[PDB]
Amino acid sequence: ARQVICWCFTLNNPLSPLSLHDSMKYLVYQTEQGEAGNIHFQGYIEMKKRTSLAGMKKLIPGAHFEKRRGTQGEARAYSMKEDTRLEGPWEYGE
């Protein structure tokens, strides 16, 4: 059994809410307040396994993603900033 790292990305001024992916396994995101009255989405997403950024970007082409593992396992606790947290957290998928 092999484990994969979560994908940390940030979506600013989203045109719509995210959803589960047939390729991924779990979906986690939350809404935050910032950059003008508008809102942004922030969370972690775990893909199938051998899925590059192309897989995630395919769902939301035009966002900031990071697979460098800047929070591999650490995002399970901190996740996002509660001080600036607006909505969530939210879990979807398996």
Curated annotation (Swiss-Prot):
A motif (RCR-2) lies at residues 40-42. A motif (RCR-1) lies at residues 8-11. The active site is at 78 (for dna cleavage activity). A divalent metal cation binds at residues 32, 40, 83. A motif (RCR-3) lies at residues 78-81. Belongs to the nanoviridea/circoviridae replication-associated protein family. There are 3 rolling circle replication (RCR) motifs. RCR-2 is probably involved in metal coordination. RCR-3 is required for phosphodiester bond cleavage for initiation of RCR. Essential for the replication of all genomic viral ssDNA (trans-replication). The closed circular ssDNA genome is first converted to a superhelical dsDNA. Rep binds a specific hairpin at the genome origin of replication. Introduces an endonucleolytic nick within the conserved sequence 5'-A[GT]TATTAC-3' in the intergenic region of the genome, thereby initiating the rolling circle replication (RCR). Following cleavage, binds covalently to the 5'-phosphate of DNA as a tyrosyl ester. The cleavage gives rise to a free 3'-OH that serves as a primer for the cellular DNA polymerase. Homooligomer (Potential). Rep binds to repeated DNA motifs (iterons). This is Master replication protein. It comes from Faba bean necrotic yellows virus (isolate Syrian SV292-88). The chain holds residues 2 to 95 of 286 of the full protein.
